[PDB]
Each structure stands twice: as structure tokens, then as C-alpha cells.
């Protein structure tokens, strides 16, 4: 279900194995109805903050080639809007560190938060309104839907909240037809690999493939 | 001190249990009545997140409950099951002998998670939460309730 | 903002008649015991009766604070006792300046 | 078929004739508190007593249906209040057509 | 509206508080009595396999219980413990403050397994189940009980 | 050894936005108190009544079946009226009230 | 049978509920009162290891409780936590709606283990244990109590006691 | 007591067919007597959600036919029938006269189950040869062949005399050896060959069946 997408649209891809080493999976429930829903280990605010810092730092990774400063936006896939395509489940919140702490409830209820936006987005990735009291769009920062099966793993059947993996993919232009652009793309890739493989954060376990 | 209404020939008179002298004879305990009138019918606005602004939590006040004999059609009832941010339940289980409001038009179900500063949830206006012929000052879990207040009557 | 219309439910039985229906093992369940009604128009009573429930709120809250029991069923019974004590607890006179029982020749 | 004999028990106590026995820590247990007796012959009362408990059962079932509490200890008190309420709640008269009291001239 | 008997000079007079005018007197609450009379004195079958045909199970009607002052000498009493097909007791436990029937001439103790359609056990004829000065509609487990009906009396001084 | 002074707390009520349980005082700020210095013909006679009431009351409780007994004072009120007014009264006033007037 | 005191003009009259005679007006149920007076105001000795000799345990008597309207200012209050030799508290937990004595001068807490022959602990002199507007016959754990007795009164138009 | 029985009556004039029986899926349940008694637990293969299956297999086994020459060889032609032509069937199921319409019985009312298969099993594991279970059902535990069924021969995996705790309901089919008659031996062997194949490939996951 994963390699089908990478052979129909893509472009070289940068992907990381992500799994929560310390925390565990907690419980939640949708507001109006919908029984009980458990949320996977990488789905806790005590740990969710860290994975977004890693991705934002990756977007800010720069590499030196000749007299130019090569950024991700120079070589990334931007289908539209110059925002790079980010196949990550954090993209349901438009990839901001001041947004994934949001709240709407009161001293009685919590109508909507990251949880309820999570459950709706994985069912309607292309929606511009989560139909909750927060009306937060599910579309990514690059203007396209984020299919949860490409950004989650370790879950059973369609219970994506039970996923133990949060898959992040960075599509990068292959530049097979342009050697000069390929050299700049490879320069950024070398910096990206070194930064990721030595990311000092005990709350996260990061590898490749 | 507690006002008492005397219903004589479809007209209401407000008096007490001392100021009345006689010619208002009370013949049996049957004609002493306690009625609970709904508060939604006194000009309020009730949604599920817009009626939560009328009640909140407090600690230190023990709960109390009274009985009312006759009630009124509730236009909007509520059924709440609240759980702490990482806890079990905010609202207490209903005490034995308490059922839901007999006659509800529409019921606003809700099972949610939220913060709960305080042991019990009281009304922020002084009214009661009406249950099946029992009116209390707190909110119990999984039981249909309407917000109202009790009046005491003598009927001729 | 008064509602002139009152539709009430009354949970009291009908003693004169029954017939193999007073037995709890044959009778109605926990919901089929209520008698209902309606009070449309003649809005001098219902609007004057919403103005009584708003006034006895303060007294009823203060009464419950002092009481130690949980459920209070005896509010009506006490008021009946207080009725007789005011009338007959004190001594009346045949003329009755503050008491009843008018004489007749 | 009626039982003319009626051997009964009553769980009532006396205030006097008690030395150190009124204390719960020194008194009888939960079973030695009943005083009993016997009512032989006298069948006009007993067989007419067994034919009243067959009639009050329907009213008691309906009353228990009406109420909300589990245990009902108040019935006799309510009956006493109703007695006083009939006798004196309405205005009496010197003649007492439906009331009482005797006018001396 | 409950019937109320007046005992005067060892003769019984059935009246009501709605009835009665002036000749009868009520001086104190002590002379208002509640008496619970047994049904076994009305000549009915008494065993376990045969009394079961006088009470059955029901759901939806809550239990009720009332107090009575004086009782009789129970010819027979019953003690029952029923567990659902796997591991649970149908009969609710005796509510706090309820004991066995004080004076039984013979009891009937049996404990086995059986089906239970219905939350509570009700009497199939309209009669009460008598306990220590507390008459109920339902059957509780592990407590002696006798089936009877209550009367309300005024005793002349 | 009798104590002539009686310091008593009484939990009876008698204000704006204070009757509401959500705004009102807690479980302990509901008591009012007083003082009974000197005139020790009432305090010591009061202590000589609770010592005699205990024998009857401990036997009254043994009869009942309920745990909490709130109705003793109501029962004495009914007994008050029944003794006065339960029996037939007379305007002559041999033992009954109703002061004659003509 | 139960003595009832009538207080008029700061003067007490012991009488019954039937020998009242006429002219002693009772106008409202408000002027019926029940007052709980402490045993410490009757000349007793109140230590924590020397007051444990006026209560003892018994089996077979059900507990009974009774309410009172007005109490006294306790000079001593007690708070006991006693457990059977292995792991079980002798004293039953307080029933729902029973709190400590409202006004205590000095509390006396006592933990520790001790043998307990009997289900419940009663008073060896016949007195009550006073709780928050509720007087009992037994002792409940973790709740402040004072040993006292109840009196029943009719007040005059002054209704403050 | 097991091999003692097979050498005193089933001496080498008789051959025996026996199978291992144990409940793989279910477990052991608990039963209590009607008056007071004491709660006695039952072994796994004594639960009726599965106990109907162990009787379906035997009545099928009684119905296997084998072809020899122009004759149809049945079990009754070669089985030990001491009386009554019913074959000797040494099994717990024979306490109930071996029928699928009998082992669902009851006695009681909507209050108590006075008697059932449960009490019937306890009685004859103590009194196999008696004709009346002294319960309200008065059902005999004598077998269909007119003889008692001893519990220790037909049960296994139990502790001491608690035959209730047995995890095995041993079933034995005595067959004439026919050592003195070759022709009858050939027909007996023909039925045996059909019998082993049927039981070895008897497709029910609720049961585990083997030999010895």
C-alpha cells in the first residue's frame, strides 16, 4: 500500500523510521459519540513536540555548493504555493509548533483538540473543515491531502490511532535530466543524512528506511 | 419565611404559613403539593456548549436533594458522562433511587473529557437539577436531568 | 419572557378502580404510571406561578443547608403541623379576636 | 378455615423496671427484645382482623407505587395529621354538626 | 384512603379517616398500631416445590418496603439462595437494617442453581414478604421470611 | 461538678448572591454561636435534664429499625395536639383549653 | 415518659408531654429544640489513655444514631484509629453524612494496634457520641467526636439556645 | 482396576475398541446440589456445549457397516451382548441410556433446577447398578445392555474418587475375538477396519480422539 504511491507520482524520497522508545499509548474519546479510542505511543503531547522540531530543523537544513546556499525548497517537490511536500501526519496541523497545543473546551468538556482533528483527518485527509467546533482544515501545507497509511505504521486494520510509527517522507527531485541541479540536491542530502543520524534526542528513535 | 401559594378558583395568592388566619381551610394532606417548574421556559438559550456556562464545580459543599410531586414537560434534557483529563469520572454515580427525567422532548447526550476543578458540579444561578421526582443541587452521571426550581402549593 | 402554556405530568394513582393491575408483578413498569394534562391560556396563573418558583428558591436553598439528612420528604408534613399549631396550639376565645370558630345564636 | 387463635409478638419496651439494663452494652441482644402473648377464643375480633389485612393490601401497594423512597415509616404519622386536619383544619362550630365540642348555656 | 380498624372493648369496627365523625377518640400515637398477619393461617400449601407457584420474577418495577409494629408466630419460614447459571446471585442482598423473621416454628433452607428471567422476585398474588419489622415486596438472599399482609389499627385506651 | 457557663454553636440560617451553594460558605462556615455567662439556675438545671432523658431515649431507639431518627420532635408535636384536642373538649373547661367568653 | 423541659424567662421546668396543662403556649415547631451537652462539663477525667475505660466492644446490638440541633463548645475531642492485630480496623468507617465535631478545643488522636473482642464499641455509662449534628451509639474511625447527652426542650418566644 | 476388568470378563475371548477422549477447547465447570450439598466441579468433557459431540460419535460408531461377501456386517453382529440385543457400551454416556434427546432434560421450575444430568452423573458414579437415582427424576443409570457402568473404567484424569474432575470419558466397545471361528473373525475384522478409519478422520475440532 506504500510502494504503490511512490511509483505513481514520485522524485527521490527521504524517509525515516520513527518509534517511541520511552512513552506508551494512552486513551481518548470523540466528543459527541464514538466509544473509546486509544492513541499510539508516538501520539502523546509529552513526546509529539519533539518530532515536529526535528522536521522543522530539516526544512531549515542548508548546504554549501559553490557560492550558493542550497535549501530544501530549491530541490523539494512543491506541486503548487512554494511549500515543500511533507508526507507527515503532523501536516494535518499545517506544520506549526504553536498550533499543536490548541484547545477549545471549557471547565466541563474538551470539544476538539489534536485528538479529534486526528480521527477526522485520517478519514477525510482532503477536507478543509474537520466539522468540529474548531473548523481546522486537514489539508497539508503543500495544498494536498495527507493519506494516513503513508504516514503511519504499526496499527491494526484501520485503527490508525493505534499506530506505533509516524512516517515522514521528503520528496526530492531526482534531477536525472539536469546534472547541475543533481549536484546541489546531493549536497543537501549529505547534510540531511548527517543531521538526522546524529540527532541527540533520547525521546525519539530515528533511523532510515 | 418560605412562600406558599394558595390556589383558589384558578387564581393564585402568595402568602405564608403564619400570615394566613382562616377562611382558607386545609382539609387533608392531599392538597399540599410540591411542583417543579422548568427553567428553559423562562426565556433562556440552551445548546450543549452554551448551557455549560450556567454551572460549575466546587469543593466543600455536601450535596442535598429534595422531592417534588408534580413536574413539567422538559423541552431539552441533558445526559452527561464526564471524565477527567487523565482520570476516571468527574460526575458522581447517581444515588440509589434516582432515575432520569420522565418526560424529555430532546436529549443532548454527551460523553466527554475535560478538566474538573472541584468534587461536585453546582448551578451558577441557584436553581435545581430535576430528576425523577427528586431535585438535587449537583449533577449525576448518565441520568437525564432538566434545570428547574420547586414551588409549594395549597390547593382548594 | 413568560411561557403562558403549561403541560404537566402527575405521578399519582387512581384508587377507586384497578383490577389485576395493582399487583406489581402485573402492573405497569417504572414509566407507565404518569397522568398528564395541559393548562393553555388564562395566563394569570402560570405566569404568576413562575414568579413563585423564583422566590422560594432562596428559602429552599437555605433550609437544605441546615438539614443533615440527604433526602427531604417532610417539608409538606411539617407545614401541616405548623398550620394547626398556629391555630390551635394557642388558646382561642369564643369571640375570637385572633382565632376562628365563629359563634351562632 | 380462619384461625381463631392469634399468638403474637411485639417489639416494645418499658421505661421503668430497669437497672443497668437500658445501656446497649449491658442490655439484651437483637433477639431478646420481643414481648409476646396469646389471644384465645374471641373469634369475632381475630377473624375480623384477618379480613382487614386482605383489604388494605391493594391501597398499600398503590401507595408504595406512588412514593419514591424505599422504606416508609411515616404512614401512621400522616394518618394522625389527617385526623387532626379533618377535625380542626376547617372551622368548627358550637353546635358541631360535623365538628365536635359541647356548648353549655 | 387505607382501611383503618377501631378496636373497642374487644370488638372490631372497620372505618376510614375519611369516615368517622366524633364518638371515637385518639389520645396518643402509641395507640396507632401496625400488625402483620401471616397467610399460612389462611390454609395454603406450604413447601418449596409448591410455594414457588405463588411468586415469580419481574423486571422494571423497583422494590419497596414498609414497617410494621406487631407480628404473628410464623408457621413456616423460607431461606433461599439462587445463583445464575454461571456465578451470580439473582436475589439482591438484604438492605442494611433488615434481619430475619424473629419467630418461626419451622424454616425451609435450600441453596441451588436456577434460571432467572427478571431482576427481582415478586409475589404472584399481591402479598408482602415479612422480615424483622420490615415488610417488602421482593426476596432477599440468606434471610428468613414469611409471606403475609399488613393491617392498620387504632386501639381504644 | 457543674459548669455554670454554656458556650453553644447553632447551625440555623437567617444577603446578596450568597444563598447559592456554588457561592455560599463551605461545610464549616455555617455556624453561629453565643454565650450564657452567670445566672446558673438554667445551665445546671439543663445539665440535670439530659442525664435523665438518656434512659428513655436509649430505649426509644431500641424499638425503631431505622438508623437515623429525625422525627422525634415532629412526633412530640402530634402528641401535643392529640392530648389537648384529640379527645372531645368542653367549653366549661374542666381540663381543656378554650377560654369561655360571653 | 421522656422528660421535656420548658424554658421561660431563663428558668427551666421539667415536665412531661402530657402534664403540660394549658396556658403554656406552643406556637410553632421552631421553638422545639434538641441540645447535646458534653460529659466533660459534669466533672470527669479526660486523658487519652484514661478515657478508654468508659467504652468497650460488644456484638449483637445494631448501631443507632440520632440528630440534635445545637451542641456545646468541647474542651476535648477524640480521634481514634485502632486496627485488629493483623490488618483490619475495628472501628467501622463513618456512614455517609457523618462528620467531625464542629467546635473542638483540643483533639486527641490515637493510632496503634489493639485487640477487639466485639463488632462495635459502645459506651459503658450509657451516653452518646456526638458528631456533626448527629449523636450515635457507636464509634466511627477517623472522625472527631465528643462524649455527650441530648435534652429536648420547648422554648418561649426567645428561641436562642 | 482397568486391566483387571479386561482380564476377568473381557478375557481373550473378547477384543476391545477404546479411544482417548479429552476436551481441547473448553475447561472445567462447577455445579452445586439442590438442598445444601457442596459445590462440586466437573471435568472439561462434562460440559453440554461440547458433551453432545461425544455422544454423536458413538451412535455413529454403532451405525458403521462393513461389506463382507454379500453380507452387511454391523456392530451388533460381532459385539458382546450379554442379554436384550443392545451392545455393551462402556461409557459415561450409557448412564443416560445413550440417546441425544435425553441429555437435555431438566426437573425444576423457574426458581431451582431440582434435578438434571448433573445430579444423575454424581449418583451412579457411586451406584452404577441401581435403577433409580433417588432424585425427582427417578432415571436409572443401568446401561442399555443391562449392566452397571463402573466410573473408573470409563473416566480418567480425575483425582482420588472425584470422578467429577475427570478430563477423560473412556469409551470401550467389546468385540468377540472369534478365535474358535475363522469365518466370524473375518467379518469382525472387516467391521474393525471401517471402524478405525472413521474414528481417525472424524472431523470435529471440539474433540481430540486417538487410540489406546
Curated annotation (Swiss-Prot), chain B:
Site (Involved in receptor recognition and/or post-binding events) residue list: 26, 32, 57, 64, 139
Cystine bridges: 77-104, 90-116
Localization in the cell: Virion membrane; Host cell membrane
Glycosylation sites recorded in the entry for this protein: 9
Domain of life: Viruses
Membrane-topology descriptor: Peripheral membrane protein
Annotated spans, Receptor binding: 2-154
Quaternary data: Interacts with host entry receptor NPC1.
Function in brief: Responsible for binding to the receptor(s) on target cells. Interacts with CD209/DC-SIGN and CLEC4M/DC-SIGNR which act as cofactors for virus entry into dendritic cells (DCs) and endothelial cells. Binding to the macrophage specific lectin CLEC10A also seems to enhance virus infectivity. Interaction with FOLR1/folate receptor alpha may be a cofactor for virus entry in some cell types, although results are contradictory. Members of the Tyro3 receptor tyrosine kinase family also seem to be cell entry factors in filovirus infection.
Protein name according to UniProt: GP1
Gene source species: Sudan ebolavirus (strain Human/Uganda/Gulu/2000)
Portion of the full-length sequence here: 32 to 187 of 676
Curated annotation (Swiss-Prot), chain H:
Effect ascribed to mutating residue 112 to A/G: Loss of interaction with ebolavirus glycoprotein
Consequence of substituting residue 118 to P: In NPC1; late infantile form
Superkingdom of source: Eukaryota
Lumenal-side segments: 1-212
PTM field: N-glycosylated.
Locations listed in the record: Late endosome membrane; Lysosome membrane
Glycosylation sites: 63, 70, 86, 132, 165, 180, 206
Outcome after substituting residue 126 to Q: In NPC1; late infantile form; Common in Japanese
Description of how the protein assembles with itself and partners: Interacts (via the second lumenal domain) with NPC2. Interacts with TMEM97; the interaction may decrease NPC1 availability to the cell. Interacts with TIM1. Interacts with SLC38A9; this interaction inhibits cholesterol-mediated mTORC1 activation via its sterol transport activity. (Microbial infection) Interacts with ebolavirus glycoprotein.
Annotated disorder: Niemann-Pick disease C1: A lysosomal storage disorder that affects the viscera and the central nervous system. It is due to defective intracellular processing and transport of low-density lipoprotein derived cholesterol. It causes accumulation of cholesterol in lysosomes, with delayed induction of cholesterol homeostatic reactions. Niemann-Pick disease type C1 has a highly variable clinical phenotype. Clinical features include variable hepatosplenomegaly and severe progressive neurological dysfunction such as ataxia, dystonia and dementia.
Domain notes: A cysteine-rich N-terminal domain and a C-terminal domain containing a di-leucine motif necessary for lysosomal targeting are critical for mobilization of cholesterol from lysosomes.
Entry's family note: Belongs to the patched family.
Full protein name: NPC intracellular cholesterol transporter 1
Provenance organism: Homo sapiens (Human)
